[PDB]
Amino acid sequence: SRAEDYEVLYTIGTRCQKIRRKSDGKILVWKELDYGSMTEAEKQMLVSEVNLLRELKHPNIVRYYDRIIDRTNTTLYIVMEYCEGGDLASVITKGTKERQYLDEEFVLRVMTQLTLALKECHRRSLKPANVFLDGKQNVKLGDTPYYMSPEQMNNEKSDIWSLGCLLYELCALMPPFTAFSQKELAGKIREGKFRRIPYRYSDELNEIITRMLNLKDYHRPSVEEILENPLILEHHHHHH
Numbered sequence: 001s002r003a004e005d006y007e008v009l010y011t012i013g014t015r016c017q018k019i020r021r022k023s024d025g026k027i028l029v030w031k032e033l034d035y036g037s038m039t040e041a042e043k044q045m046l047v048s049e050v051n052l053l054r055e056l057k058h059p060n061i062v063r064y065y066d067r068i069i070d071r072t073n074t075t076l077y078i079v080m081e082y083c084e085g086g087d088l089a090s091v092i093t094k095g096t097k098e099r100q101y102l103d104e105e106f107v108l109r110v111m112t113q114l115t116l117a118l119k120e121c122h123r124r125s126l127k128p129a130n131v132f133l134d135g136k137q138n139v140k141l142g143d144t145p146y147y148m149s150p151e152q153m154n155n156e157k158s159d160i161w162s163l164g165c166l167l168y169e170l171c172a173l174m175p176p177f178t179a180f181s182q183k184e185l186a187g188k189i190r191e192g193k194f195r196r197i198p199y200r201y202s203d204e205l206n207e208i209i210t211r212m213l214n215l216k217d218y219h220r221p222s223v224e225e226i227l228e229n230p231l232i233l234e235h236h237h238h239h240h
């Protein structure tokens, strides 16, 4: 419950740091938030926000472990699970640089496990840099507008559109809709046209990604219709 219980190993990004718990040596991360400039109105919005995050237990959602206070630093520490595979943005960037497309089995895993993550988020009522990989091929959802759906521009189905954009980009190594301006971008999104994902990928994968990118939210598949898809098999699910 105190910072003294953990030892910082190193900075991941800037603050995000990799840490080891002294009691058992568990590898975790935490996030540094300086609330030394927040109002009592912001710290109230911050406290409740975190306590909802505490409530989300699911194998495909990044797991929360602890929150720590240090009045002397005015620093809030949010302690979470470490995903050693990194984020998906980096996987995508890695693929452009080395001119190598991702396996369809990888894409099916992401599709399957992010859909179960969304299904859990919808019961309690999305971009490559917010999706993490652990050490066992599991996919975990954590936490210029390429993925903005037409409706959220003019709804659970809005998340299906974002999922659709994410999977497309894993396949094509670029988003479905690109532009140099916002109006140009919004132009292309509303027209709903894009290249087929590369031919190395099956017609069946292309079909479901294209369905998620439908202009009509009511034409996009639901979480349940996605998991019914013959492409999706037990081995694409999470495993301890």
Ligand SMILES: CCN(/C=C\c1nc(Nc2ccccc2)nc2nc[nH]c12)CC
Pocket: 012, 013, 014, 016, 029, 062, 080, 081, 082, 083, 084, 085, 086, 087, 132, 142
């Ligand atoms: C802001 C910087 N990052 C933020 C958070 C983060 N990263 C990891 N793992 C991990 C990351 C990179 C290389 C290798 C591993 N795990 C996390 N778990 C929660 N947040 C995490 C992503 C670039």
Ligand SMILES: [Cl-]
Pocket: 059, 060, 138, 238, 239, 240
């Ligand atoms: Cl898991």
